[PDB]
Ligand binder design. Structure first.
Ligand SMILES: [Co+2]
Ligand SMILES: [Co+2]
Ligand SMILES: [Co+2]
Ligand SMILES: [Co+2]
Lengths: 221, 221, 220, 220
């Protein structure tokens, strides 16, 4: 209103300032025609992907949804992956989770929020998968563990899609990554699930969970 | 590989450089706990939303999919909207399209791409909706018109979801926007579909199409 | 109580069968793989087995509100890819019905909740033919929409990557769109019938054109 | 040819009915609104009408591969919200079947295409019970998975916002999970039966525990 009019003014000021400087930005960008990374992050979008990775303009192909999920039967996410992998021939897909995630917390609370709750049931199913692990943890540290287990689970989901299986069976080079950053520092931490094939997917996911299962005593009660 | 290791180095360099400067960035961000805008853009993600709008960190709630679609029965997009509107109480949803869009072009070509084609059928259905308009145009200008008609159609879809209808029937303040930017300049151009209610949705969408239907003769053959 | 009735009915039926030495279950298992995919409405007014008098297990069945093949519905598309790629079914039939609650719900202004999102595809279809349906007597609209809806769903299925790929590799696959009137149960072809991309384009445009000729008793 | 057969059968059937002055269509229309939602498998080995001997139009029906209620499937959730919110159906039944191709497909290593994504939910379910199913003789696994799958689907439906909201507002809604053996057609309750969140939690955990006791003839 005031806000939208501002936004257009902000934008104009920027775009025009880019003209009055014949700015290479839109030239540099158009030369990176095709992205090299598919980035699956959360709609929370706290610290922008472009800022975490400092990749140049147009390098990232991006999907965001609530709590950075790759649901087995989500047409939306799968289309993005199939297009990225089969059409764009992208060789890295990054799933990025983040701490203090609204979806993670909502998946965890009892409030019935409406339609989103259904979306969040998959995180709840995951929470239950590692219920022993998570109840062996401090209530105020659970959201953070769950965020990481989530990322690891989402990578495992990604690597089980028929799109990714079929890209690997057919020879394509494709690596899967699962990372989290603390919103207070923005350090990307690899969660351990990294696959370039079906066998490394399974070995890698089992190892990551095993690794997540050794608790620092500053996490236990 | 080399690329991923680089990314982590880039990221480390950034995050650490943010420490050695006790940088307010992550403090400022955490004070914008809740977003004020839902931004539905394309996974192409050419010019980042944060750069178009120059909004401060954490202000945007973001969804991206191929060709910035709001499909009536997409659980993924709808969850993002229902969460944004009902939980986050966001009062502006922006659908942003962009020129030279990979999905737009793919929707337009005959190549069978696999799974993504199904996703793109909705754009094809739209292309057919304005077939008279678009065949009354220069072949090299069609993708650009289709990009804009798309945005306008997606806003019209958004404003017809039960989530948005029900937010309006129940008194909530919610405005819908549909914009495109040229990837060569980044000027956000409003496409005319702007609604704050069901009646302004319909009036606004009819007017936008009517307006799109008057051609400059530098667009006609 | 309602459930107790249903277990009882079920027991009476399945025992009536065991003690009779019923060849039914035996005969059902000798038909391991179906030959038709039938995509119908959840209203399911008269069952596909009654309409088609097919041998048990010949039908692979998907039902959803108003018998849609929505471009991006994982569920129906999963059913289709499995019937086509895996089960090698060579006939997919979409079958509407008159007096379809799904069709009536799509046209009413009422705000019903989540199902309205599902039915917005129908509304998009009603708009594409708003001229025709608008040249028509409003009380006859639902029945025309029932039929147009079926024709669009066949056009939709014919355009799925799954069907196109089945056709590009020589697989024999044909698509059908039928409606039956709930008052007599007769299966009426709606004219869209495809065995290929080209035949899909032609009968579709043909079906619509033939649907768009209104009887002057209904014309506005 | 296969289609000509089906129109012929259909004509013979619906005419047999008209000339007989069949009370069937009349009686069908006096049952405008169904009372059960039935979520079944597309394999559709024996039809819900045969299993339940219900009066025509009592069943509102959704079928998909392996009878799933997937948390985020618009299609099934559209069927459920419409049966529950709009049609006021007070019974939702999920019904598995033994010798389910969907269940067999989920367990096989084979890469079948898009349908494998659909079946990954089943695999997640198989893993959740991999201990139990792993304590079990491999050739008996599919039948146990058929039954566990049904129990998880009821647990899934019981957790949808739609069912929870129907329960939070006092609406009478109960959920059922049944399996029938394709060799005899008997409807067997799998123990998860819910009329509320609390009863959902208890019978679910109860059903699994009772499913997890293996007959020593099958124990590893
Ligand atoms: Co988040
Ligand atoms: Co684009
Ligand atoms: Co119907
Ligand atoms: Co089955």
């Amino acid at each position: 209103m005031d806000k939208i009019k501002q936004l257009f003014a902000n934008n104009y000021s920027w775009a025009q300032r880019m003209k009055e400087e014949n700015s290479t930005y839109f030239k540099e960008l158009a030369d990176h025609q095709t992205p090299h990374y598919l980035w699956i992050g959360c709609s929370d979008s706290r610290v922008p992907a472009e800022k975490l990775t400092n990749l140049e303009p147009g390098e990232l192909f991006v999907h965001r949804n609530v709590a950075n999920q790759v649901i087995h039967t989500d047409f939306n996410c799968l289309s993005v992956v199939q297009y990225a992998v089969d059409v764009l021939k992208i060789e890295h897909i990054i799933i990025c989770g983040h701490t203090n995630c609204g979806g993670i917390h909502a998946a965890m609370a009892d409030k019935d929020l409406g339609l989103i709750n259904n979306w969040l049931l998959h995180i709840r199913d995951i929470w239950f998968k590692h219920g022993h692990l998570l109840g062996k943890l401090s209530p105020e540290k659970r959201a953070d563990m769950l965020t990481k287990i989530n990322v690891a689970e989402q990578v495992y989901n990604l690597g089980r899609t028929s799109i990714v299986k079929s890209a690997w069976e057919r020879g394509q080079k494709l690596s899967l990554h699962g990372w989290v950053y603390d919103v207070n520092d923005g350090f990307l931490v690899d969660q351990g699930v990294m696959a370039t094939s079906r066998e490394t997917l399974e070995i890698s996911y089992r190892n990551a969970i095993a690794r997540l299962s050794i608790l620092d005593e500053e996490n236990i009660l």
